[PDB]
Amino acid sequence: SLLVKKYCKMTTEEIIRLCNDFELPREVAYKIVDEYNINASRLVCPWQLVCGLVLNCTFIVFNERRRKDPRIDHFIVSKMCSLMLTSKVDDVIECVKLVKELIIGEKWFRDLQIRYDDFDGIRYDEIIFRKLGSMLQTTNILVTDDQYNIWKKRIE
């Protein structure tokens, strides 16, 4: 497995087209590059951090498709196990939730969550009523009305 591999001589171009493989724009790809090249001297396995940065940015950049179609959340993580040579699906979400510790307080990730409007998976207007303890919050039991209209057009 590539997650087991230790002390990899990273060049820039390989993580450039690793970021370019997942439809990420140029700005967040350069921020992931600059985020790696500061912490690179103290990394046990750099693929842990690179996979965590790539996935934790692509659930924010492609969150609008993620809220509509759920199975892409089952899909794109499976595009890790095909190319990272890993048969374990718990290891890659472990990579996500262990880069989440190192990424949360930083300014560029802050600005990414502003500009794509994603705050632990939901919108700002959802989380301001989740934190306030509102009874009138949109409980996730109903199907979405946009999804209802999508299925109505699927019939049509």
Angle between helix axes 12-20 and 46-61 (nearest 10 degrees) is: 30
Phi-psi region of 121 (alpha: psi -120 to 50; beta: other; left: phi over 0): left
Q: Which of 33, 36, 94, 116 binds other proteins (CB under 8 A)?
A: 94
Q: Which of 86, 82, 22 is nearest to 55 (CA)?
A: 22
Residue of the chain from 10, 16, 43, 81 that contacts other proteins (CB under 8 A): 43
The kind and range of the H/E element at 100 are: helix 90-103
Told to check if 155 binds other proteins by CB under 8 A, we report yes
Least distance in Å: CB of 41 to other proteins? 9
Site for other proteins in 74-93 (CB under 8 A): 90, 93
Task: State in angstroms the smallest separation of the CB of 114 from other proteins.
Answer: 5
User: Alpha carbon of 58 to those of 10, 114, 134: distances in Å?
Assistant: 21, 15, 30
Q: Which spans of this chain sit near other proteins (rule: CB under 8 A)?
A: 39, 42-45, 48-49, 52, 90, 93-94, 96-99, 101-102, 104-105, 110, 113-114, 119-121, 124, 127-145, 148, 151, 155
